[PDB]
Amino acid sequence: ATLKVIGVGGGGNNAVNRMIDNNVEFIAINTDGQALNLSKAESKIQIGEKLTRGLGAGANPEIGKKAAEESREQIEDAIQGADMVFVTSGMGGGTGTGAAPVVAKIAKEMGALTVGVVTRPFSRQTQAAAGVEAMKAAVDTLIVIPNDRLLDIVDKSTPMMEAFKEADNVLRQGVQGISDLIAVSGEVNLDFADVKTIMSNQGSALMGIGVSSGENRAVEAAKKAISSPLLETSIVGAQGVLMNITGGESLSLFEAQEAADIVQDAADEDVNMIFGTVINPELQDEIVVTVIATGF
Numbered sequence: 036a037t038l039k040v041i042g043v044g045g046g047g048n049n050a051v052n053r054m055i056d057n058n059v060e061f062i063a064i065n066t067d068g069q070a071l072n073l074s075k076a077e078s079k080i081q082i083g084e085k086l087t088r089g090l091g092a093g094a095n096p097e098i099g100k101k102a103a104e105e106s107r108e109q110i111e112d113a114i115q116g117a118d119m120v121f122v123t124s125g126m127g128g129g130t131g132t133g134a135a136p137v138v139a140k141i142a143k144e145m146g147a148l149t150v151g152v153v154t155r156p157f158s159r160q161t162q163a164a165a166g167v168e169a170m171k172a173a174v175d176t177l178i179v180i181p182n183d184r185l186l187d188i189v190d191k192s193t194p195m196m197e198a199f200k201e202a203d204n205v206l207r208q209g210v211q212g213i214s215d216l217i218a219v220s221g222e223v224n225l226d227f228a229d230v231k232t233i234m235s236n237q238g239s240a241l242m243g244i245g246v247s248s249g250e251n252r253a254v255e256a257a258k259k260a261i262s263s264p265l266l267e268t269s270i271v272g273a274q275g276v277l278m279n280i281t282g283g284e285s286l287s288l289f290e291a292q293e294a295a296d297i298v299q300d301a302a303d304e305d306v307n308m309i310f311g312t313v314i315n316p317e318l319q320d321e322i323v324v325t326v327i328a329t330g331f
């Protein structure tokens with residue numbers, strides 16, 4: 036499975052520059068031609084050249100949205116061949132904010148599992164909130180992750196793709212009535228209220244993702260999956276919890292039972308829990324635990 040990481044706008048370009056420093060391709064997209072010159076990505080696309088001709092360096096999301104639509108054909112050609120796509124506009128609230136949803140819409144309408152990666156903190160009248168809402172509408176799964184843990188999505192790409200495929204199958208079948216899902220990785224400083232606005236009023240779920248390898252991998256992966264402030268409060272009171280651990284041939288029943296215990300003890304006593312264990316060679320020595328909390 037081939038992955039493509041697309042940084043949109045100044046923020047995404049800087050994110051992409053850091054992640055370059057494999058089997059993952061990097062694309063940089065921006066309305067600002069001056070900034071793409073500073074991108075280290077092998078694939079660069081300047082979008083909306085007709086639309087932005089004569090303008091200066093602007094911060095209008097609408098220009099970015101229409102810039103991406105003007106260059107739709109160039110974007111499809113660069114994404115062609117991608118199984119999964121990571122789209123992020125990074126720490127910026129300008130054109131990239133508007134272009135990034137369109138890039139995801141293209142990746143999605145091309146049949147690639149499309150993940151929106153949000154590093155910019157948010158919660159309502161900021162441009163950040165508007166962008167996050169727009170991205171949410173366009174992607175299969177939105178994932179919120181600390182800016183300093185950004186390299187994890189490329190470093191641990193194969194386990195992450197298993198987690199996003201799990202979220203995809205949960206949505207498709209409406210497991211435990213879930214119809215809307217946001218993913219979390221790392222020490223994301225948020226509570227359900229900060230994201231309640233932009234999720235469906237019934238069927239909303241939060242998925243924590245923990246990945247680890249080496250010694251005490253199962254314990255660490257399971258604890259990271261529930262260590263985010265967002266999962267710590269949501270897991271308490273959660274009427275339902277979907278728990279899955281996936282590893283390679285080396286995954287023992289001891290590691291699987293321990294991970295389940297850690298999640299069960301954190302969860303409510305009356306919680307309706309579904310436990311899953313999967314032996315998947317492709318993970319090699321990596322472990323990934325997903326914990327989906329619903330029914331708040």
Ligand SMILES: [Cl-]
Binds near residue numbers: 143146147148149175
């Ligand atoms: Cl899809």
Ligand SMILES: [Cl-]
Binds near residue numbers: 182183
């Ligand atoms: Cl930061």
Ligand SMILES: [Cl-]
Binds near residue numbers: 313
């Ligand atoms: Cl699998």
